[PDB]
Amino acid sequence: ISYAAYLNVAAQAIRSTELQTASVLNRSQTDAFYTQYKNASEPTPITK
Amino acid sequence: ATLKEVEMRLKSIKNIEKITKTMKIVASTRLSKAEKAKISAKKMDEAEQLFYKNAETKNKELIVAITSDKGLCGSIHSQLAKAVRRHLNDQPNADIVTIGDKIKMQLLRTHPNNIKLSINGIGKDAPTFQESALIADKLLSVMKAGTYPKISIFYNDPVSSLSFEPSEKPIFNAKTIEQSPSFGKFEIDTDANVPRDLFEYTLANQMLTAMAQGYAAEISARRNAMDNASKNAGDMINRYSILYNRTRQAVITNELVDIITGASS
Amino acid sequence: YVAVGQKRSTVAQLVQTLEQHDAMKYSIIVAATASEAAPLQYLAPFTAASIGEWFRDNGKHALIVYDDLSKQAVAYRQLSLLLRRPPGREAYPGDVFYLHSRLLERAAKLSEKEGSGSLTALPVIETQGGDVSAYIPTNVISITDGQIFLEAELFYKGIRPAINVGLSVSRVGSAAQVKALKQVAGSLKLFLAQYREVAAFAQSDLDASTKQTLVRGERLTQLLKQNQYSPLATEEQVPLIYAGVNGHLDGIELSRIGEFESSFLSYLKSNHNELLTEIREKGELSKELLASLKSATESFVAT
Amino acid sequence: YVAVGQKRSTVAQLVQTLEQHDAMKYSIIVAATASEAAPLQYLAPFTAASIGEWFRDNGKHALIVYDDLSKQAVAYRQLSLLLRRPPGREAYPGDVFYLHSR
Amino acid sequence: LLERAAKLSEKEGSGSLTALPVIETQGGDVSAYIPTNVISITDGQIFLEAELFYKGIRPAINVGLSVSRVGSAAQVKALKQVAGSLKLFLAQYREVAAFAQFGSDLDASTKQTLVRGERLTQLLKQNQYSPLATEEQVPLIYAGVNGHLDGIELSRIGEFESSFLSYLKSNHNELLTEIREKGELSKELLASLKSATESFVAT
Amino acid sequence: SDLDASTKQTLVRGERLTQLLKQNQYSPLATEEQVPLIYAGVNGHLDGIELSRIGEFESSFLSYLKSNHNELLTEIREKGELSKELLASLKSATESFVAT
Amino acid sequence: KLQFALPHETLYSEVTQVNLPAKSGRIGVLANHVPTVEQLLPGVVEVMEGSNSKKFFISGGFATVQPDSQLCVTAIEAPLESFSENIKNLLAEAKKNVSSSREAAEAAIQVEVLENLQSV
Amino acid sequence: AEYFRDEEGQDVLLFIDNIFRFTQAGSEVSALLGRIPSAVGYQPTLATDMGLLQERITTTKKGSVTSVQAVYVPADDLTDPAPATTFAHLDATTVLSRGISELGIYPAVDPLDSKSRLLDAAVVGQEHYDVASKVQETLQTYKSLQDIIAILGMDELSEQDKLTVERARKIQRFLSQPFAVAEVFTGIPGKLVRLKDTVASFKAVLEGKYDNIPEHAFYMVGGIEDVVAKAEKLAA
Amino acid sequence: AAVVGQEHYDVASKVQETLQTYKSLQDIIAILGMDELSEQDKLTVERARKIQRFLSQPFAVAEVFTGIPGKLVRLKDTVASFKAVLEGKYDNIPEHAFYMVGGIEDVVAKAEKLAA
């Protein structure tokens, strides 16, 4: 997969002593849903 | 009648004023954090821009846009829509990937050759690299972003803490990097495919900057709007206040007429 | 104390309170109670004023508190209507102005040939909707030389006295202000003015200046609370206000403002009863007193 | 030009203005100043209109400006109240419509 | 005049004149002397609101300004059970609706209320000169209160009401007979009704 | 608010017309003189003069009209009803002055 | 010098020695360095200003020396001392789960971060 | 009542209903007597008539009489002179609100709008006073926060604010207690709760000692003992 | 509807409801931009602004006073015209085209006039 997806996963993995700031956790937490679209016509939005 | 209709509407107006006041103030608190993020991010971005300039990168066409799902953040939704519209005369059939519900409705109308991919749920959240990364990954696969020799991103540059000017910038594809000449003063062999890596990385790094710029502009717009609201509400308060006062005086005149009728007895 | 239309039970409590605080031995209560007839009510402030003339004429000083002229008005209304005189604005007799004005001009600070007599007066008007728009308030407000306008929100917010100082004014004001207290409280007016304005942008914390104002202002507002039926000596008013002016109270926790106050006063009483006596007799603050006071305030503030 | 309920000074300035614009020679001024008695003020528009009718009944075109009938209303109000007739609507006489319409 | 209408005892032959006063309000001024007086005398108010008349409830009864002090003791036992939280829902709808016209980002709880509430008002809507049998008011309130119509789209609520009644008349006419006959809803009847309503959600 | 081009054009005319409306107290104007001025604005020739300078245009236009052809105004003085010739003369005259 | 940046604070702007893990192996940069673009891998990183050394654990990013003799580093998140024992244990468990389940790329990176941490 | 107070010497607990009717009746016979009516048509003798009634009722040394006088506030406007005149004469005002009733809370008494000058700190004791001050503040905060929660959202509230709101909703429905004479107007048997028990129970709530109890297990029940019991019922 | 038919009554019902909404949002429109109103509402507002203007009709007697040649339109035509407008059929042409003019056909023609 994409190089920046590799880098992303690395950031997420680093977010897995142990304990870290809220901004890290927020940067590794997403409530979004990629909404496939077209034309209007939208295949159902699934979590991102 | 007059009296009650004045008063009930005046009460509504009062309640609206109070809510918008509260919102405006809370918005100011929130605005500081939004802006703070934008500084650090923008500094990070500039270091990359230093490359793009020196490389003389010199970029169909993709349009990406950034707004929130959220409303009552001024005229961001339609001002960004308008700055999109000017550049949607530059390719009407261009596919717009919309980060944020509000601008989407307007753009979708302007051409229905636009919304192909959209991202809902960024609007509530703060600018975060992970989101940008996932969006990038989906952009490459879904929109075949690298294929398009142009990419253009739209956002609201938060010019001052009371203003926002809608802005755009060009994201440089892997093709662009290849054929830019003064990329050659920077070095790579073939050990890495720096166009194919750097494109992806700056797809997100630029996108995060656009998001940060936008987020601050959004909160700024909300503050601006709710302030102007307080003024508009005040004017109605005053107009209905004068009406209230006149209505009050007249009733006393009727009562005095009743007492004067008693005097006639 | 001129108890007008006040139920006999309330006045009984009043009398009892006066006895409790051993104040009966200079108090006079002219009473036209709720039950007492509207003619008696009409002549009740007039009667009270007459008592005042004897003191005033003797050149001595006294304070007559007409409480409340609002009930005086109603009695006049009842009286007038029954005498078939047309009722004036807001159905209160046309010459109600004339009545109120007669009463309020029978309080005075006499000439020096007249032996500088004093009959201080403090009329009380109860605003039933809080509307100063109302005819009886408007008339009286005009006649009076200053007003204090207490606000309900403040009362609810447990600020007793619930005076809203924005809507309080004195038209004689600083002429009758203790020199010491004048020195240490020009600032106080200005601080509170800012605190009021920046209270409505604190719903938040933005400018460093606004938050600084807020700390000084909130502590001051808390300081000016007073538990009802405890009076305060001026020689103990001035130190507390000085502290606030110098913002030493800023550090002191809001909840601990109260604790600070009593402790500070006792600390001042033990350490510097010289200061208290000096304040009392000088009636003004020397540079040396403000110097000593600052040192003391710092020391107490540290503990 | 009917000047009703107006300060005698102000009217004099108007007269002087008109005579400066040499317009007086084609115009009449009827004056019913504020000082003048309230019933006289009441009768002032009616009287002025009679003068106008003489011109009208010469078959000659004319104009009459009644400035200000609002002051006639206050005048009629005073008269009505002093005739102890019950106040009309808005405390202005009940025959105030009739006064104006006639 | 008004106190000459009363429910009398059975040693008075159990008579009862019921009275309905009608009072025109001059600009809705209830502080006018005649309106004030009458309000005290009477045991209920059935305030009618003009704006709601225009809004499409015809007749329109502003339920906020309507009270019945005597209340249920004349409300059908069944109808009391079903409409128990109808009042609560409407009251919540009223608060929520005020917020809703400022149309800010809605609390999930508030938009549940908003959606339910919108349907409820539309459900209530009356059609002039056409009463409805109580036996056939019990189903409609059951359906609404048990949120079967909360989902059903606002526009076609009017269609739904007519059709639901027709459907029950066709199929569950036995049930309707029972509601008429027994006037309080048994567990079995509530379930039967629930099953019927559920089936009619998708038609 | 979003202003449609149709509304914007009307607003632009309306504002320019408002300038035209204005009068200066104790200065009465000839009926004849009013006829060209109204023609101009109605036919939207006051787009051709920015709002600030509309007042300048008006006085200058009147001076122009008298100098260019007081014949038109003399005609409106006697005829008091426009003809096709007067209408054309006004179109021509208004365009001519508007340009300068 | 070193210009180091993150989207929450820009850590550096003159840094003496920078030690970087790159797709060219390992690179050390001191003052003037010929101008390159290098991808920063998920890393154990050292940045030294003087002999004093700060040790960073990095989610990878990009490095690009600009032709003014400044090493522009942009990376997503950096500390090493903060990152470094139970978290390594958790990463081992997580690695086991990740092994079975893009899932490959995730597992490679998961192993890499776990290994890079294990090196600490 | 005077006969009871005086000549039978005993304490009483007078009840009058509704004293707005006393005003209205008096207004009518004033007009019948030809007296020029005062404000909002109310009798010119309104004050002294109210006064005569009110003054007559009092605690003497012969006895004690405790009036509860109902007042109807026409069109819920107490700025209307007739409620306002009565407002002076009555020691311990209580406001019953339509809104609170509509929320389903019976008592319909709106706590922040009710005012009793018997809530003096010494009179009810310092503990009672302090607890009640804390309750009053908590509810007032909750009312202020209602606006924020509604529009701005529930989630933007602070952790501190959220705990205050959660407790306030519990307190709000802890107010809700059934009434024995509203076994007819409801069915739930009423509860007579001791003064001491109430002080104790509200204190506990504020401390959050029963924040492990459902909100609805405070709703329409008596004392703390009942609230705990209803937690078990809801749990089941 | 027992008199003028259910269809007539229904058409009128929608007009009343729409206008009442429009009156209702007048406060909100002033305090907060009309742009910052809900999408559903903006359609209503646009429709209502059109309806309000549509209601106009030059009078024949006062054709002089209005200065517009009078318009008198059939009742049967009126119901049809409003029905269409409510179905947003002619909602796509200027608001000012509905202003101070008669029937739907005239609106279409006035669109042509405006278009020039």
UniProtKB/Swiss-Prot annotation, chain A:
The scientific name of the source species is Saccharomyces cerevisiae (strain ATCC 204508 / S288c)
A single MF term (Gene Ontology): proton-transporting ATP synthase activity, rotational mechanism
**More about this protein:** Present with 4280 molecules/cell in log phase SD medium.
The UniProt family comment states:
Belongs to the eukaryotic ATPase epsilon family.
Biological process, per Gene Ontology: proton motive force-driven ATP synthesis; proton motive force-driven mitochondrial ATP synthesis
What is the role of this chain? Mitochondrial membrane ATP synthase (F(1)F(0) ATP synthase or Complex V) produces ATP from ADP in the presence of a proton gradient across the membrane which is generated by electron transport complexes of the respiratory chain. F-type ATPases consist of two structural domains, F(1) - containing the extramembraneous catalytic core, and F(0) - containing the membrane proton channel, linked together by a central stalk and a peripheral stalk. During catalysis, ATP synthesis in the catalytic domain of F(1) is coupled via a rotary mechanism of the central stalk subunits to proton translocation.
Entries under InterPro entries matching the protein? ATP_synth_F1_esu_mt, ATP_synth_F1_esu_sf_mt
Segment forming the signal sequence:
none
Spell out the protein name for this chain: ATP synthase subunit epsilon, mitochondrial
* SUPFAM superfamilies in UniProt: Epsilon subunit of mitochondrial F1F0-ATP synthase
What cellular component terms from Gene Ontology apply here? mitochondrial inner membrane; mitochondrion; proton-transporting ATP synthase complex
UniProtKB/Swiss-Prot annotation, chain B:
Effect the entry attributes to changing I259T: In ATP3-1; dominant suppressor of the slow-growth phenotype of yme1 strains lacking mitochondrial DNA
Q: Pfam families, from UniProt?
A: ATP-synt
Q: What is its main location?
A: mitochondrion
Q: Where in the cell is it found?
A: Mitochondrion; Mitochondrion inner membrane
Q: Tell me the GO BP annotations in alphabetical order.
A: proton motive force-driven ATP synthesis
* A GO molecular-function annotation: proton-transporting ATP synthase activity, rotational mechanism
What keywords would UniProt list here? ATP synthesis, CF(1), Hydrogen ion transport, Ion transport, Membrane, Mitochondrion, Mitochondrion inner membrane, Transit peptide, Transport
Membrane topology according to the record: Peripheral membrane protein
| Coiled-coil ranges (or none) | none
Q: Under the cellular component aspect of Gene Ontology, which terms does the record hold?
A: mitochondrial inner membrane; mitochondrion; proton-transporting ATP synthase complex
Q: Which PROSITE patterns match?
A: ATPASE_GAMMA
The miscellaneous remark of the record is: Present with 28100 molecules/cell in log phase SD medium. PubMed:12898710 reports two tandemly repeated copies of ATP3 (ATP3a and ATP3b) on the right arm of chromosome II in several laboratory strains, including S288c. This has not been confirmed by the yeast genome sequencing project.
As for family, the record states: Belongs to the ATPase gamma chain family.
Subunit and interaction comment = F-type ATPases have 2 components, CF(1) - the catalytic core - and CF(0) - the membrane proton channel. CF(1) has five subunits: alpha(3), beta(3), gamma(1), delta(1), epsilon(1). CF(0) has three main subunits: a, b and c.
Name-wise, this protein is ATP synthase subunit gamma, mitochondrial
Q: Which organism is it from?
A: Saccharomyces cerevisiae (strain ATCC 204508 / S288c)
From Swiss-Prot, chain D:
Question: Where does this one sit in the cell?
Answer: Mitochondrion inner membrane
> This protein's superkingdom?
Eukaryota
Tell me what the record says results from G52D: In ATP1-2; growth-defect
Q: Which family does it belong to?
A: Belongs to the ATPase alpha/beta chains family.
Quaternary structure (record): F-type ATPases have 2 components, CF(1) - the catalytic core - and CF(0) - the membrane proton channel. CF(1) has five subunits: alpha(3), beta(3), gamma(1), delta(1), epsilon(1). CF(0) has three main subunits: a, b and c.
Known role? Mitochondrial membrane ATP synthase (F(1)F(0) ATP synthase or Complex V) produces ATP from ADP in the presence of a proton gradient across the membrane which is generated by electron transport complexes of the respiratory chain. F-type ATPases consist of two structural domains, F(1) - containing the extramembraneous catalytic core, and F(0) - containing the membrane proton channel, linked together by a central stalk and a peripheral stalk. During catalysis, ATP synthesis in the catalytic domain of F(1) is coupled via a rotary mechanism of the central stalk subunits to proton translocation.
Additional record remark? Present with 41500 molecules/cell in log phase SD medium.
What protein does this entry describe? Answer: ATP synthase subunit alpha, mitochondrial
**What organism is recorded for this protein?**
Saccharomyces cerevisiae (strain ATCC 204508 / S288c) (Baker's yeast)
> What gene codes for this chain?
ATP1
The full protein's residues present here are: 240 to 341 of 545
Swiss-Prot record, chain I:
User: How does the record describe its quaternary structure?
Assistant: F-type ATPases have 2 components, CF(1) - the catalytic core - and CF(0) - the membrane proton channel. CF(1) has five subunits: alpha(3), beta(3), gamma(1), delta(1), epsilon(1). CF(0) has three main subunits: a, b and c.
Origin superkingdom: Eukaryota
Subcellular location per the Swiss-Prot or TrEMBL entry: Mitochondrion; Mitochondrion inner membrane
Per the record, the similarity remark reads: Belongs to the ATPase alpha/beta chains family.
The UniProt function text for this chain reads: Mitochondrial membrane ATP synthase (F(1)F(0) ATP synthase or Complex V) produces ATP from ADP in the presence of a proton gradient across the membrane which is generated by electron transport complexes of the respiratory chain. F-type ATPases consist of two structural domains, F(1) - containing the extramembraneous catalytic core, and F(0) - containing the membrane proton channel, linked together by a central stalk and a peripheral stalk. During catalysis, ATP synthesis in the catalytic domain of F(1) is coupled via a rotary mechanism of the central stalk subunits to proton translocation.
Protein name from the UniProt record:
ATP synthase subunit beta, mitochondrial
- What other remark does the UniProt record contain for this protein? Present with 164000 molecules/cell in log phase SD medium.
Per the record, the gene is: ATP2
